[model samples]
Structure formats: structure tokens, C-alpha cells
Target: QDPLTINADLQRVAEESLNAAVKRVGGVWGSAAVLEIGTGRLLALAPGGTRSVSAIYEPGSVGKLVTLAAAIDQKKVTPTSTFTVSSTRDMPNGERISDDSPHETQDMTVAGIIAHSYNTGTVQIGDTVSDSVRYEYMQKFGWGAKTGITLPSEESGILRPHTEWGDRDHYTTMFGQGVAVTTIQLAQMVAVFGQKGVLIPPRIIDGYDNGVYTPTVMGESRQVVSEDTAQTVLNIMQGATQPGGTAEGIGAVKGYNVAAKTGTAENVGSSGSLTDTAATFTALIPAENPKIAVAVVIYKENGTVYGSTASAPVFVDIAQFAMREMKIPPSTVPLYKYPW
Candidate 1:
């Protein structure tokens, strides 16, 4: 028998903050979750009654990080390696490939591609591995399967087996259009990156039987990526909010240096269109010394909403609240920048 407890203070802040954000932003609903890097403890779960555990949504460009970690860890590519990318291009198949924003063709590195969240470069990264290998990395990151958290309806978000994936699935999955993941799963993925590529299953059960305080046994921690590769991944993500980058506005979250990725998914109701979208941003704050990984997701029912505009708004509010509550300091030295 276990009595539940969360980071109560942080929980209250997130629950209240996310409630207001969802209404203000006109979302069908929204989800926010925070997880500790070291302990795998769930610090906060907004809408704790719903999306936090039961709802599943597409992760969009944020899933590019999966392609990224696999590429780097497999030694298939490095962050500084360059690719000549077009804003839009057709894959070898008749299907077309495109980025969130269009631009002239130019030489760009894996790092730069990630900063811009360009589908062109991510496809290249995913191509380096066969579908089999690609699916392996997905599993390694705790996707396509239930996380086995001590909670009900913890969905094993969709991921078709490699054998089942066709040619176009190759390119589309790389850019995160074909797969879906739960909120807890996304938070854990961020934690894996934040903690030097270690995958610790997200835990909500801190302990059993109240005041006596019997801590729950945690799942084994696995090395999802080598330290060097993970740091490079972080550097690439940090580039996203740098001057002239996709998340430039949210990057200005004052005080702490945040490393994040922004994503805008297609409306589930409308095929091949953006009638409505799910905007999301996931981050490791105080980038150099990350304590927690946070994700904010908003399912907008109207208008064009980008990750920067919708999800990152409450991210600012929740992030600041966590930093203050945890008393985590900003990086003492200048933020580290890897060569692009």
C-alpha cells in the first residue's frame, strides 16, 4: 500500500499555472510535466488527472532529437558535419519533404539543422540507419512501449515496427509526423538528454506508506548515448534559441540559460494541413547544470500556433517557478557553445 506524494509545491504551481494557460491559449487541453535528471522523480504533473498519464499526442519536431541522438551515438554523424539542405525537397520517392519554414538552399551542419528544426537534415540523419536501427533507437529512448509506471492507462504510444514501415515512413517518421508519445514519455526523454544520455524511467511513486517513508525501488538506469554525444546534442538544442533561431523568443526566458526544441504538429482532424496544431517545447534549464527536464504542450483548436508562441508561454511561467523553488543557480561560467 502506498500513499502518493509529488514535489507538492511544484505540483501546485504547475497545476494552477497550466490550468490558466490552457484556457488563455484556447487549447482543447494542455499538459506539462517536470522530471528530475538524477532521481527520475516526477516533480510535477499538470492536469494530473488527464493528459499527464492517459493522453497521447504527436511530438513533432521534438522527436528530431531521437534521430539526432541515434546519428551521433552510432557514429554515423557528428554535430559539426555539414549537409546541403533545401527548405523543401522531394524524397527519392514521389512524396515531398519540407521544413517548418522555407528558405533558400544552403550548406548547414547537423547542429545548424537541429537549431532550425529542418526536416531535410533530420531525414539524412535517420537515413544513416536502417529502419531496424532507427526503431532500436526509438525503443532505447523509451518509446513505442508502455513505461510501466505505477499508474493506470500509461499508454504505449504508437510506433510501427520497422518491417511495417514503407519508404515514405522512413522520411516522415524521421521528422516526427508518423509517431505519437505520451506526456510522461516526453518528459523522460528530455531527462535522458539532460543527464548525459542516461535513461531513467520516470517515477511518480516516491515511496510507499506515508510518514515511515519507504522509497520505491527505481528501474535500472541505462546509458542511452555516450556523454560526448549527449553534450553535442545539448549544444545543438541550445542553438535553437540562440540569436536568429526558431525559439529566439523563448530563449529570452531571462536569468537561466535554457536548452530546448520547439515543435508544431499537424491537426489530427485535418490531414495534410494546419487547420489546428499542437505546439510544444521541451527543455533542460540552466543548460550547463540541468536539474530538471520540463515539457509544455498545448493543443490549439484555432489559428496558427507555433511552439514559440503557445507552449513556451507557460514554459516560461513553470520554468521560473521551478528554478526559484529548487534554488538551482544559473551557470556560473559563460554558456558553452560547441562548434557548429
Candidate 2:
């Protein structure tokens, strides 16, 4: 690769390509991080604006993917496990948690809960696990801390103490509320799932370490969950792009194996009248043997409030660019199948 041309290309995509795409989708601001799964080489972008890599923002429902992985790793739930998503459930603290989405049936499998992003089933699953355990999983998944990425002002998004969570906050946290995440952290977390539960801190610069030049060393890797559990979660994530899933057609890339999740979280005004919203999409390209993990966050969308409608298309565009730039070929592995 020619160094001169590559930097120019990166600048064009980060400054021009991404900026236009974000606005076209009705977003006020946008950021993305694309990493090579094998090498950990990163391309972080804050296109169209002079935003730092440490820009803190709400991750919205994309955080559900973290909770889902944690729940499975803790052995609290299985992909086939079923939960009833009828009305609201009464918490031990007397707070009520309910499914925000209207559904026809009461029974929903854990996979369905994730595929459709059902608030009820998620809270029900959260109830089965202790708060401390959930907190532990969140930390393991790289929440509440900076991801050790080489970027200025990189924020470790807010994760409240377990004791601070009221009954309602506990339930909401399971489905990505009352917490915030940076795009880099979300990409770092997704890389764990894509790497079969191994946590690899993202590295943006190759050899520059705090002004000292060094060899490009891959960050230390740690096992966060069992391989089987990681595969299970990956398979469940596949549902998000399949037919009848929340992401549906927008997330599906033709002739490519893609596993992705869409999140649409409300930004309630002080009066709580839905003033603005955040839409997000996170994905592993060529899911069968993921070469890249990309996270796209669009802040405060005006017209559309859903990730599938707003963020997913932008995700697709960035993903396509990443694949071409990184020279990733189409996946040859067989499609994912959930082992019941």
C-alpha cells in the first residue's frame, strides 16, 4: 500500500464521505470505527466535524448486545429460552418494567428478544441475574472504562454502581438505557463477540506510543467467555439482519455473511416528550469469518427514530468501504446455525 495515497483516501472518507452520509440520513453528528479483526489496524472517523475520538454519546439499544452476551456467558439464559412479553413485570423494588413494543404473542425466545429488541424479554432475563453479576459482565464487556484505545479524551462511558440502580434503572440498563458509550468502546466490545470472546483493546495508531515510536504490537488479548457461548451469541445476532428481524432488508448485504444489530433510543426532554433520539448500528462484516467490526452512531436524528431506518444504511456504506479498502474477500464459511 502506498502511504501517500492511503492517507488521502482515509481523509476523503472520514471528512467527505462520512459527513455527507450522516447528514443525508438526518443525523446531526456521526462517528465510526472500523478495525481489522486479524491485525487490529483501525480506521476511526468523525467525518464532517472537528470532533475528538473521545466524543461521548449515548449508544442507545446497541448496548443490548453487551447484555445479551453477558447473560449467555453467565449461564443465566440460553438462546432458545423463552420468556413471556405480555404486560409489564413488577420489580422487587416495586418499579414496573414493560415491553415498549407492541406484540401479538406473549411467548418470545431469547433469540427473538434480541432480533426484535424487545424491552420486556430483556428485562425478564435481567431479573434472572443478580445486579452484581450484571455489573461484572458490563465491566468485562468494556463498559464504564476507557477501552485503552490510543485516542485523546477517550471516555469510558458512564456505568452506575449496582447499588445506585433502582428497580427501573436495573431493567432499563439491560436493554441499553441509563448508560452511555463512545463509538470506539462499542466497536471494541463487538470485536470481542466477533473474536470468539477474546477481548482485544482497539489500537488506532500503529507505532506511535505517547510520542515514542515502537513496533506495531497487537494489544493484549484476554478470554472473556467460552468459545461456545460466544458462538451462540453471534448466531443470535445474525437474526437481526434476517427476515422478520428489526434490521431486516437494510442490514442485509447481498452475497455477504453479515451479523449486525440496530438500536433506536429516545432522548427524552426534561418534560419527557421525545424531543430527539439516537440511532445506532454495529456489525461484523462477513460474519462467518469476520474480518472487520464496524460501529456507526448517529446522534439526535430528527425525522427517523429507528436505527434500521437511519443508521443501518450508513453502516452498510461504511462497511462496504472498509471491505474494499482492507481487501476482505467474501466469506466462504457456511451460514450460521443456532445449536439448540
Candidate 3:
């Protein structure tokens, strides 16, 4: 092991710096954590008042991890598999499928579906899996469950119980509607992909017992998906950062292979009409042996927001900072291309 210098001052400075961001962002339930990948150092997890350190809010589009988790488990497709938008399936609530939407009439691959965050393609997979099976997988991936992170109101966000929901509820929840999960929980799953399916709980501090600093592991983890599946997920995420991809700006980061997924989900008003919006992006960098997994949710109070426009940049900004700070060098060669 390389001898290292411990700089308590620098550590304090880093925590304070992150907390400063917490103060400036207006406390709307944001949390950031930086782990050393090889080691479990709880670098940062500053909770906002709007979102308790332990309280839960919809990770929004970030929750798409659930859907992707299903995809990996079934091995229905791989990252490189080509996907074409077909109208052979029915829509939720028996609504007519729109052939004019952005995802429609396109020969979208599985990589395209992930990078573009296609709700239609995702829901189509949901229709294939049984509700009972989907929920079982969601639970396996820590959905509708507490992450055991330090905080309050920490109940698993809303998810449909198979017994109560009709067939329609199954499809909607499959696409990330009707199901609720906190941002922290969502981050845990993302980290799992980074760790190749090992999920450590969100820890707050290095414990001090008798002047000895001891690290803690979050919880036990099982095989959510194969390592190959995880790698394919990362490959598709890398494509999202490519040209014409949802995460346009991040896809262009110089000297790095970044993989990401974007989310744009519609919110409806009491009048049963769509009104507000929630946008999000989730990504891990390097395209191989990913060390950092991040999720950013943008709550647009008044206007339409695309995941690419609203949430992708926030992820890019934070990822750039983390990559530089952690001294993670870019891979010499990556499976996917980055414009920069």
C-alpha cells in the first residue's frame, strides 16, 4: 500500500465546500455523495431541508434505474441490440399509441432507448414482464424500500401492490409512474451498477470509537444482474453522451468516456391535464469499471423540460468536478465515442 498523508484540514474544507452548495441551491432536497470506489469513504451527503437527510422524494426520471434493472435481469436485449419502434403493442389505459412522437417511427436500438430515455420503449418492456415479477425485481434492486441511509420520512416511496392495481397500473408503474422512490435510494442502485452489483448503504461519517476511525458497509447485496449486463448498461449510457444523444453537453467531455441516461416525465394537474415537469439524468463515467454514479433531478415548476435540457448539464457539471477532484484518469480507449 502506498503511504498517504492524511489532511484533516482538506477533508474539512471539502465538506464545507459541499455544504456551501447545499446552502446556495435553496434546500430543495438535494444530496451528493463521493465514494472512493475501492474504499468506502462517505465523502459527502449534505441533506437539504426541503429534503431531509433521510427524507425521500421522487428521484424523478432517475428512477428509471428500476426499469433498466428489469432489462438487465431478463437479458431481453443487450446494449448493442437494435430497437425499432413498433405499434404492435397497446398503450396504457388503452390510449392510442402516437406515431408522431419523438421516439416514434425511428429505428431506435436498446442503446438508443436508454440514451434517449424513451418512455414508450421502456413501457413496452414492462408489458412483457408480469407485475408480480416486476415488483419482485424492483424490491431486489431496493425500490419501495428504505436505503438504510441516515435520515427521516424514509419510507420506500409509493409503489403499487400487485393485488390492488389493475392491469393498467402495472404498465404505468413499469414506466416509472405510480411508483415512488427517494433520490437516495435511486443513487444506491446507480452505485450498484458502478460496483458491478454490490450496493453499499449510504453512510454519513467515519465512526470514531476510542479514537479509532472505522468504516462501515451499507448492507448486503445480491446479484441484481450479471457483470455483463451491467457493462452493457454502461455502454448504452455512454451512447447517451454521444452526438444527437439526450445528454448532449456531457457526451462531449474531453478525454473521457461517459455513459448516461436522461429522463423527462410529465406531471398532471388535478384537472387531469399535464402541467408541470420533472427532468433527470443518471450516469457513471469512464465507460468501464465506473467509479462514480450520479443522479440529478430538475423540478421545473412552470414549463416543459427535456431531460437533455433540464437535467443533463447539472450531471455534467458535477461529474466533471468529481472526476477531477478524485484524480480518476480517463481510459486510454473506450468502447463508445465521445465528441471531445
Candidate 4:
């Protein structure tokens, strides 16, 4: 989320590369961002087809970036904090399932939960905080809200009003079930943390002030996490790309630091199971001081998918192009840690 300062030429280079890439993949919308890692410029946005930042779609697991940030900022838990859906875990109507069940993955840590895109685990973390607290953090992170970036159908996602929650709402929302958001919102959510806990609205069209570009308020600057906490989350996120990492073998840019999380969210079904699923991929390259962050979502009609495996390549290619176009060199020193 650093304001990027790059050769003006990078704008064209980034746009053409991203646009062609998205179109080649036949994606609905693609946004590619490059920054200085010290300053946030939002160098380029390449919308796919008629889709754009204004368009609201299911953010899928990408929303975890925001919820995870809120957890960090609120001290709900640390990256290493273990998460499990036990008999004591939230179970509406005394919801119960066998330990060997498909839902076994739901019981996981904030680290494994996000790395593996665990729906129940994400929701489980919310259990640590209150409904009011989670909702307040969601608003703070710009979820279930509009970014107002210059795009069509830029959606302010659906987070049911506080009064509407039954216990199910909490579980559903924790894993991004009962919510809706845009990829732009997801990017900004992570960018808020990437920009050192300063939540700046995602900007597509820049406005000038006496020949200088200034940020417009998407949301007022809210300090979501202390710099230390944000960095700690950054470190844990780095684990997602190491050997045995859930998101490993994806976003593999040879010479730069990488931090990412992937998600596979179920499209609710009448039988109360995800009938048709959605995929989401999210990443911030050069994790220590992220220069560019990107998120991609592909609906069911696109193909059968899982967020980590399916959408990760998008982050990989775009992040690589951003570094190349911006002339960003590899880190001289290791910027993040790896669990493996």
C-alpha cells in the first residue's frame, strides 16, 4: 500500500500487461497495482470486460484479509494463535459434525485457516470477538461497504445488520458466508495493513491538487493494527508460500518476497451445504513493505475451482509484471520469515 513512485511509462506497461493477461484468461475484471512500497501510488488498474472496481461481487476468501487484519488490530489473536471448532465452538441449533467429516478443516488456526482458506476457522476466530466488535472492525476495514472507486457496480458488500444475527449469522459471516464484497475492497483491506495500518480508499482515477495527486477518503484513516502487529501478520502470511505451505507453488516469483492467503468459499445451498463454490486468491508481494497487492475471484461458470490453487497464478503473474515494470529489484536482505 505504499504510494508508488515509478517512471510514468510503467503505467502503460502495467496496464497493457495486466489487461492482456486478464483477457487471455477470460476473466471478468482484473486490477493490477504497483507502488513504491514506501509511498502508495496505485499505479495501474486494468478492468476486464465491462466489469470494474464499482462492480460488487462475492469476494470469497479474499475478505479474510480484512477480517484477519481486524483480528490482529484488536488483538483477537496472533498469527500463531490456534483456532479449532470444538463442541464449545459456535454451533447454531446445536450444530454438530463428526471429527472425520469434510468440515474437519474448519478447525484450524488463523495461520492454517487463512493459508488453507478454512471457512469455519475464519468464523471461529470471530468467536473470540463479539458481534458488535466484528461488525465494527468490518466497517473499519471497509467490508460490506463501498470503496467508491471509479468503476461500475462497485458494491458495498452485504453484512447483515447487527439486529439480524442469529448464531448462524456469526458462523456464516466468519467464513465470508453471509457477506458480499468486491475485489477492490479486498485489495484495500490488505492495503490498509500494507500501508502501515492506514486505511486509504482504493483509488482508480487520481485527482490532482496543484499538480500533485492526493488520496481521497474511502474511509477515514483508521489505525487497524500497530506497525508491529501488521508486520507480525506479514511474517505469518509469508508461511503460506514456503514448503508445505497451503498456497505454496503459487505466487512463485523467483527473486522477491511474497506474502499471500487463498480461500475457497461455498456458495450456499438449499441443503445448507455449498452447492456451487467460488474461488479467491490474494497476495501482497515483497511482504515486508508491499509494493503491490492483488486479489482475483472466478465464479462457478468460469470453471471448477479452489481459491488457493485456482486464483494464485493471477497474483503470481501480476506481481511479477509489477516488479518488472516498476524495476523493483529483489530484496537485499530477507524481509519475511518462513515456517518451513
**Best candidate according to lDDT:** 1
Candidate 2 has an lDDT of 0.73
lDDT of 3 by residue, 5-36 (tens): 22243334434544453344332223444444
| Tens-digit per-residue lDDT, 1-340, candidate 2 | 2211123454456555457756777667777777667556676455533253566656667888777877788898999899877656666778777666556657878888888887767777777778898888788888888877655666777899998987678777887788877777788778777788888877766664445545567878878777888788788888887667888888877667788888887665446566667778888878877877778777763455578876777677666766777677866776564532
TM-score per candidate, chains pooled: 0.93, 0.88, 0.79, 0.78
Off by over 4 Å in 1: 1-5, 270-275
Q: Which runs in model 2 stand beyond 4 Å of their true positions?
A: 1-11, 14-17, 48-52, 87-92, 208-214, 268-274, 301-304, 337-340
Candidate 3 yields a Cα-based lDDT of 0.57
**Candidate 1 clashing pairs, residues 3+ apart or interchain:** none
- Candidate 3: misplaced stretches above 4 Å? 1-41, 46-61, 80-82, 86-104, 268-274, 335-340
Models ranked on lDDT:
1, 2, 4, 3
Q: Compare candidates 1 and 3 on TM-score and give the better one.
A: 1
Better of 1 and 3 by lDDT: 1
Q: In model 4, which runs have C-alpha deviations exceeding 4 angstroms?
A: 1-40, 48-50, 84-93, 96-109, 207-220, 268-276, 335-340
lDDT of 4 by residue, 56-127 (tens): 445555666666766777787877677674323435456432221254333455676666555556665666
| Whole-model lDDT, model 4 | 0.62
Tens digits of per-residue lDDT for model 1, 1-340: 5445367888888878777877877778889988877888888888866567777878788889988898889899988888878978777666678875778898888888888888887887777877788788899898887777777878898998888887788887886777888888888888887788898887788776536767787688888888887888887778867775678876455788878989888756545555777787888887877888988888876555678877877777778888888887766755555555
Q: Which candidate leads in TM-score? A: 1
lDDT of 2 at 124: 72
lDDT of 3 at 193: 71
